[PDB]
Amino acid sequence: PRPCQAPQQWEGRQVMYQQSSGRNSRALLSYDGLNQRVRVLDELFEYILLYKDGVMFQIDQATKQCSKMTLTQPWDPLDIPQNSTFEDQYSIGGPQEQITVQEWSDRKSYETWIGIYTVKDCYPVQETFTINYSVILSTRFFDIQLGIKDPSVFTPPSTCQ
Template sequence: MPCVLWVARNSSAYLSDLVHPMAKLEASSTRLFASAWRPIANMIRVFMLLMTVGAVLGTYIIQGNTAPTLTRVNTGPKPCQTIPQWEGRASEWNHITESNNRYIISFDGVGLRKRVLKEAKSFMPGERQYNYIMEFKTNTLYTINLNLNTCTVTNLTQPWQNHTIPTDATLEDEYELGAPGSGFRVREWSDRLPARRAESWIGIFTIAGCWPIVEIFTDDDPQNPVSFTTRFFDLTPGIANMSVFDPPEICKSQTVHPEPEFEPEPEFEPELEFDPPITNQNFNVTIDDDKDSGPVNSYFKKGWNYLKSWF
């Protein structure tokens, strides 16, 4: 009997030692298969996802639609629009010639007409005065020299532009002008393109009504550099007298000339020299000149050849 028990015990141990390695080998094989299958399973999932997206887009396009596109949504303030008809005054500082001029302006966005009248300066005798009338429906510019009572008729080559903020303008800032409690909110815009182009135009417009307050325009053209700062004030909606757009009789008999390229000229002429010099005395200067040499260099005159100018 003891002999039988010894055989049974040793047979059981022998069978346990034989089966246990087999179980370990099977478990190890299972783990190895699972680790090798996992990347394949992920690739199959990605492939099935791409097939599903492709089927959806294919059905969308077959039904006559276009594939959706991603667009940048600008949730900030949009450029506003100034009213189509208004009048006011403007003070322009020319940083190149270090001179200042004032203008009375009338803007007719309905009839596509503009009128700019240069204001006289009482302390600059002999200064030439000009009245500009622009009719964009007929592409005609009337330049009236008020000193010599002459008129020059030329063609407008630039298309009509509303006096407003460009649609691609960049919002630079928003702030309040004036004293606390009595000021008004404005937005500052420019033609700057982030990471692509520096600004050459800056415009400050009121938030209420989109009225122009200040405009700065620069151009570093070496042959004709431009740098102007223009302030707008005394602005009123509408046009009090539409006859300001009617050219005078002296313009009706003039022949239309091609648009001239105006060069800068002195603010007033002739240049007088006195021997001995006369100081602190009032005197009148009479212009004895029978030719019209053209208007002074001005943002309102030169700026119309540029995209962002209102004139």
């Protein structure tokens, strides 16, 4: 069992759980791993994260008032690293209609990442970050379509200067 190659360019939607708030938040997701840029649209904000630059933008969907700020965090792609240990492979659904998926744990320096990806074509289904086994942040992805249909989603409005 060798890690697959997740698509580095796709659009879909996500449900993100945070333990601090303890909540799930649904949003659309534009993931561009080639340009290391990602934009999420709340389903009330829109966020545009440009990692090649040092900047992220937070936009009121109604107001367009834009707050720009240094990104701080380093880039972490939505794929399974080569040095990640294989944990399990299971099937979601059941007999007459199933996905086979696999689960991987990178354990990046006691913070550990654990991601579940589809087996043959490797769309991301879920990603979970956990500190000392206390699940800090988890996200599920669905309706994935490869590539970006309109890259203007990553260009900030003129409100952000």
